[PDB]
Scaffold this active site. Structure first.
Site, short mmCIF file in Angstrom:
data_model
loop_
_atom_site.label_atom_id
_atom_site.label_comp_id
_atom_site.label_asym_id
_atom_site.label_seq_id
_atom_site.Cartn_x
_atom_site.Cartn_y
_atom_site.Cartn_z
N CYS A 45 -5.60 9.41 8.58
CA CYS A 45 -6.35 8.16 8.36
C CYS A 45 -6.04 7.18 9.50
CB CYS A 45 -6.03 7.54 6.99
SG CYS A 45 -4.28 7.13 6.65
N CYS A 53 -4.10 4.82 14.02
CA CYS A 53 -3.24 5.97 13.68
C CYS A 53 -3.84 7.33 14.01
CB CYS A 53 -2.76 5.95 12.21
SG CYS A 53 -2.13 4.32 11.76
C1 COA Z 1 7.62 -0.98 4.48
C2 COA Z 1 8.01 -1.88 5.66
C3 COA Z 1 7.33 -3.25 5.51
C4 COA Z 1 9.52 -2.07 5.65
O1 COA Z 1 9.87 -3.03 4.66
P1 COA Z 1 11.39 -3.54 4.52
O2 COA Z 1 11.55 -4.13 3.14
O3 COA Z 1 11.80 -4.64 5.76
O4 COA Z 1 12.24 -2.18 4.71
P2 COA Z 1 13.85 -2.20 4.71
O5 COA Z 1 14.37 -1.24 5.76
O6 COA Z 1 14.46 -3.77 4.95
O7 COA Z 1 14.18 -1.61 3.26
C5 COA Z 1 14.20 -2.40 2.07
C6 COA Z 1 15.12 -1.68 1.09
O8 COA Z 1 14.63 -0.36 0.83
C7 COA Z 1 15.68 0.59 1.08
N1 COA Z 1 15.13 1.85 1.61
C8 COA Z 1 14.22 1.97 2.60
N2 COA Z 1 13.93 3.26 2.85
C9 COA Z 1 14.67 3.98 2.01
C10 COA Z 1 14.79 5.43 1.81
N3 COA Z 1 14.06 6.31 2.55
N4 COA Z 1 15.65 5.83 0.86
C11 COA Z 1 16.36 4.95 0.12
N5 COA Z 1 16.29 3.61 0.27
C12 COA Z 1 15.47 3.07 1.19
C13 COA Z 1 16.63 -0.07 2.06
O9 COA Z 1 17.98 0.42 1.91
C14 COA Z 1 16.52 -1.52 1.66
O10 COA Z 1 17.47 -1.77 0.63
P3 COA Z 1 18.02 -3.24 0.33
O11 COA Z 1 16.71 -4.24 -0.13
O12 COA Z 1 19.17 -3.13 -0.92
O13 COA Z 1 18.66 -3.78 1.59
C15 COA Z 1 7.61 -1.27 7.01
O14 COA Z 1 8.46 -0.14 7.34
C16 COA Z 1 6.15 -0.90 7.04
O15 COA Z 1 5.33 -1.77 7.28
N6 COA Z 1 5.82 0.37 6.78
C17 COA Z 1 4.45 0.85 6.77
C18 COA Z 1 3.99 1.26 8.17
C19 COA Z 1 2.48 1.43 8.20
O16 COA Z 1 1.76 0.74 7.49
N7 COA Z 1 2.04 2.36 9.05
C20 COA Z 1 0.62 2.67 9.25
C21 COA Z 1 0.04 3.54 8.13
S1 COA Z 1 -1.71 3.18 7.80
#
Ligand code: COA
Ligand code: COA
Ligand code: COA
Ligand code: COA
Ligand code: CL
Ligand code: CL
Ligand code: CL
Ligand code: CL
Lengths: 391, 391, 393, 393
Positions: free
Chosen positions: C379, C92
């Site tokens: 980070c 990152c």
């Molecule tokens: C977090 C992550 C695993 C996504 O997980 P996910 O559960 O498949 O995310 P989804 O899009 O399917 O969202 C799950 C729920 O949260 C809700 N949601 C997600 N973002 C939202 C927001 N900004 N506001 C409101 N609701 C939200 C969705 O509507 C969904 O609802 P549902 O369960 O009723 O359908 C993925 O984006 C990730 O790995 N992020 C981190 C990235 C990272 O680590 N980067 C490097 C940094 S070191």
């Protein structure tokens, strides 16, 4: 022991779903359970009366162990029910009925279920076992590899069709006219309620979604007559005849028949729909599979001393429009008596299921006393045919 | 018409190869062609006399269209020969012979080839059709997914066998003793030349390397009696009994029999090896497949009015040492009459083939007038059994 | 003795909008976004393309992108074939580390004008299958995003799970994390609607044959929120006592950013108004699981090195890898929350991982008032961070 | 005027042996080979591990290696969690570019001791499958070695085919290329027999459960030759009028190299005696197809920069990407072939693409006599090259 007479007591099927369409969420074996349960219900007998089951199913990869056993147990039939899964490519659903009939004829069982099932939507891709070759790994499509490629010629089924189109002089315009006729007849038959006793509805249930009831064949609506004559010839780019519209499609569905000896039908006091008169298999040069049903049909007629004119209704599976036209051309039969309520070009072609479906359709559509002849080609150069008489 | 008498005129097989072993380059269909061609040659009949063919084959994925047709045409049989591929899991090779016998009994054909084939070495992996799920996916091994996992319990056949071991108190040590017995019997039979009329050699040709002639079963030499008691119980961590040594192995091979009506044998001046007396299928709870063969065998005996004592030799397919011991215990039969020349624990278990191999073995090993009974369990809770008499 | 180095200035900082995963920019490979950003930056700088001597682009997930990703981005922007290219991977931190290493080359007088930035198309990151014999029982197809991007090698857990470890350590609760997340979306919407990325972001037209052109003109992710749902969401990285959710974590995204860097001397020679001066930078590393706190040490090193105090920083850009990270940094550094991530960050704008380190430095360049100092930190997986101090000119 | 920079010295240069494709070292990940070379380099340097401040490693094919490959190599070598790490990709030039970029940090006084090198396990490079929906009819999963490593993006041809283009233009025939190839194999064998790699190469033990240890103590590739077969081979990249074959081209290989770099002051503080001084380095780029000649311009740049002549160079290391490349360089530069690649090269020792650039600088370090100048150059996909001038102490 003397050979027993075999009757069809019921014949039931799911609607046919389009590729990745309305039934694509259900595995083949689940479609099989649905059809088997419906046939038993229509026959008016306890599930326990069914002694053994055979299901046609061409593309068994990834379906899990013993697909027919899954269909049978999935329909709540007894754990004592032996099951066998049959593969004669597109003839599978008919050959299952034929082989079950032979068991019944021998007095080896008195009541059986036989049919076919296919979910081409869920057929997987394969990767070979072994070392990954330098430069890349090939992931083959089992529909293409196992379902649709002739082994010997190394061409698609549709290219074998082109070969027959050449030899018998069956032109693109003729094949298109046939296909348009199939779509026409399928729509008319659906609109007339001609599948009310044959088809049972399927309920598709998805968590968090409203239930979807699939009550009719999907495919026949998927047509634009105006585009038909403009379509590319997909199996032979130059001077071709076969197209997406005039060929059968890839599809999902299942069909099942309850078969009984004459004695069992009487014991159980059920009303048999039709008697199984005769059946046969023929095989020819692999590329020439479109004409195999001609010989199979001729074999059955000769076996029981009937002439082509004695047949009220013909079901010649619409693998391609070309196939039906070739059959009509060689047999010189009345086209108005052939695939009268549509067929696989417009209803779809779940390959392991179609041979059962067409026998079941005859069982419902024939009038009392009439003979129906069903025939179906299969990859490798084969065909199966069956003659039934409506009771 | 009355039912026709069915005779076995020849019975031939390839050696059985180890997993990724000596025959691993050959597709199941090629092994099939070798067995079919050998059976017809031994029969001494014109190949054109063979009217139709059924082959057992459990893991058909990636083998190309119509595996039985590929075997048949590859053996040089006529293009007029109809073909059907049979799947009753491990019973496939036997069920093929039974179904072909029913056709013959009906007078529907007078000469057929029936058997089984499998190349577990060439069974592929699958990837589901559709979009790749975020996070990846494991491509399933079809041997595991379709061949060896019970659908309903979601456990390996080996873990189902554990259930029977517990219920019938058949301990690890007894299973190991049986396995050692199988290896010992197999070696002794090979060293005594007991397969000279049954097995035909296979020459494996590789461009740029020397020919390899495979003339005997590969598996039975892959053993170390001192290690047998030392192995881990691979299907169950706690209180296990089944091991790699006392279970059947994964293998490649094919077997084929020429079957005729008694009339056809007469017409063709053929002296048959054995008469097919009766056969049956039984099924029980999926998890209890090891005991299905007991019921299938009893069915045949009762049908014919023979007592267990009337049987000169038993072939109870060695899916696991556990299976054979459960059968011996439940039937109360002389263990000296069971799997006399080895079986699947030491010769290997190309699953679609073994049901045919064990019937073919009886045809050669029985003495004139003696009855032999072959039985074989199958995934899903099934078994097939067959009684023959040596002529 | 300390070396006498050339002064380095940022002359332009340009980026694509950030697209959502499988979203508006998903049809464009990372290298193409790279070309768009690079061409943008050069056009903004008002210099000939041929003045750019060398290019460094951060890019974490290079698998299947084709040979030499940075070269593709550079040649795709119409820069001369004489332009040497290097692709940088500090996870990152890649986008910032690229700028830092370019600065070092400039400082040494080895080049006088460079382009540096970052690019990533997480939408196009592929799956992998191992070379070799297929194992009995199955063959795994691994997701390179998860395997190479997001999984800590040593702990064998997601970045998100490491974050939970810091939430635990420093008592940063779900509610605070959620409040920060909402705060991020709020700032992003405000800035976007105020027109604050007018000179930072350049629009992208997506052309699909037969389809109507789509013009992507703003960041896609910040509209994808429902405040009412935020508190309800399940804790996706830890079942028991979790705090990190899909809403308060950064998302997976597509985008590229590029900066034109030059020596004070070249800016004069080319008669261009430098935007900011690059004062100092540093890398810090800690225990792999503790990456959320690595930017604290990196910022500290930078401040200590230049002899400034935390109070002297007008504007902070602490990459919003997770709401947690920003909060942990605010806590440990004791800085005015109102001075941190003023116009949103990765939680609401998205996190195309190789790009983000570059974007935040580009944002400070545009946002700072004359004479102000901005500190950007970020980070990275493995337990590291990069930090950079700049001063607006 | 001109910046006043810290003097940079090489205190050690160590490598693993190079394994053949799917060969002796195929079970070891690139990062593990990296750890082995890095640990060896620090041992040979005779310094505390804690003295290494930062680490850069070249690595072309990073797909599926896990998060932050250089961090894995470094932490795997037992270096402190406080060590920042960056993974560098300039295709075949990566190993050299790592050393150059580290040198720049040292020159700026931003660090006083660094490890820099390269690593590649071509045996363990995976196949890829696109994200999304498998098309009806199947798909071929691409080989990343071919897709990311060896295919020119713009010409859509193999590196080998690009080499054919240069063969044509400069009249470098099959026989000349074959003669060079045999010469490389000869020189490699002679050097190994003479014990010329005693201080350079460290042995690796391959440990597998149930089987006996295998100690790999020399380069595997140079033995895999049949001199009689060489002129009989067909031309693998171009069937009509071809010149490049499997024998006269470099091979696919596994290996890692690492150097301890420090400022002249640091060496004195740590009481270590330096091997060589890093004098100057440069990057050049030409048309993508023309990469074989890029090292000519890169070498010229370095000579011009320092005001030396070709004649002043005692030893040349011109990476043997193809026999074609070295001959193209000898020809254009008009240098003495007896001073080029004297102890073998990539055509016979093999070419783990990310490590070779570091290996060849390391070899110069050991082979040069006190006071002598050594010039190493290496072409890279996309039309680039790097070059470095060192002087033995
Ligand atoms: C977090 C992550 C695993 C996504 O997980 P996910 O559960 O498949 O995310 P989804 O899009 O399917 O969202 C799950 C729920 O949260 C809700 N949601 C997600 N973002 C939202 C927001 N900004 N506001 C409101 N609701 C939200 C969705 O509507 C969904 O609802 P549902 O369960 O009723 O359908 C993925 O984006 C990730 O790995 N992020 C981190 C990235 C990272 O680590 N980067 C490097 C940094 S070191
Ligand atoms: C023929 C086959 C390859 C279809 O190929 P396809 O090109 O992917 O088919 P598509 O659905 O994409 O149709 C292609 C075109 O035909 C059109 N089309 C399809 N069916 C049509 C119909 N019934 N009426 C009018 N137009 C139709 C589509 O709209 C499409 O038009 P477009 O390219 O402008 O969008 C496939 O269905 C097949 O293999 N069928 C044979 C099955 C078989 O061989 N079974 C065994 C028998 S032995
Ligand atoms: C059991 C099975 C999973 C193989 O398991 P495996 O652990 O991969 O087998 P291996 O070849 O690795 O053997 C494991 C150990 O047993 C030993 N072994 C195997 N067979 C042996 C024998 N006959 N004698 C002595 N030792 C033997 C091996 O030497 C090995 O020892 P090691 O760990 O010191 O190397 C597989 O053969 C199987 O599933 N068989 C059942 C087939 C089946 O279910 N068929 C259908 C019937 S319902
Ligand atoms: C050329 C390359 C594709 C390998 O080709 P290949 O045909 O699979 O090589 P093989 O190992 O199968 O050998 C091919 C033939 O040459 C022969 N051969 C290979 N090396 C030989 C040598 N050193 N001496 C004599 N004969 C040799 C083999 O015996 C074989 O003969 P055969 O066809 O009669 O069996 C691969 O090594 C490559 O791509 N190299 C270039 C790497 C590169 O571009 N690196 C980046 C630099 S820009
Ligand atoms: Cl057939
Ligand atoms: Cl069964
Ligand atoms: Cl370059
Ligand atoms: Cl780091």
């Amino acid at each position: 022991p003397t050979l027993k007479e075999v009757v069809i007591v019921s014949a039931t099927r799911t609607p046919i779903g389009s590729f990745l369409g309305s039934l694509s969420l259900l595995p083949a074996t689940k479609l099989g359970s649905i059809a088997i349960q419906g046939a038993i219900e229509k026959a008016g007998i306890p599930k326990e009366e069914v002694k053994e089951a055979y299901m046609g199913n061409v593309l068994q990869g990834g379906e899990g162990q013993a697909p027919t056993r899954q269909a049978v147990l999935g329909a709540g039939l007894p754990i004592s029910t032996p099951c066998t899964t049959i593969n004669k490519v597109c003839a599978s659903g008919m050959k299952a009925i034929m082989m079950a009939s032979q068991s019944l004829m021998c007095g080896h069982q008195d009541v059986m279920v036989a049919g076919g099932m296919e979910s081409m939507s869920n057929v997987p891709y394969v990767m070979n076992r072994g070392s990954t070759p330098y430069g890349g790994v090939k992931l083959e499509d089992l529909i293409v590899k196992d379902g649709l490629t002739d082994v010997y010629n190394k061409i698609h089924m549709g290219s074998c069709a082109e070969n027959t189109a050449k030899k018998l002089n069956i032109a693109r315009n003729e094949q298109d006219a046939y296909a348009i006729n199939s779509y026409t007849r399928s729509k008319a038959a659906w609109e007339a309620g001609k599948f009310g006793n044959e088809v049972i509805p399927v309920t598709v249930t998805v968590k968090g979604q409203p239930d979807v009831v699939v009550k009719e064949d999907e495919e026949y609506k998927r047509v634009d007559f105006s585009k038909v004559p403009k379509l590319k010839t997909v199996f032979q780019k130059e001077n071709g005849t076969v197209t997406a519209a005039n060929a059968s499609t890839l599809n999902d569905g299942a069909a099942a028949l309850v078969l009984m000896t004459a004695d069992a039908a009487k014991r159980l006091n059920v009303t048999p729909l039709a008697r199984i008169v005769a059946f046969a298999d023929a095989a020819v040069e692999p590329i020439d599979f479109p004409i195999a049903p001609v010989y199979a049909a001729s074999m059955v007629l000769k076996d029981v001393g009937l002439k082509k004119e004695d047949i009220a209704m013909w079901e010649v599976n619409e693998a391609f429009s070309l196939v039906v036209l070739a059959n009509i051309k060689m047999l010189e039969i009345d086209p108005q008596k052939v695939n009268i309520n549509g067929g696989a070009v417009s209803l779809g072609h779940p390959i392991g299921m179609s041979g059962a479906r067409i026998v079941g359709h005859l069982t419902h559509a024939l009038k009392q006393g009439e003979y129906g002849l069903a025939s179906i080609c299969n990859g490798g150069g084969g065909a199966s045919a069956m003659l039934i008489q409506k009771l």
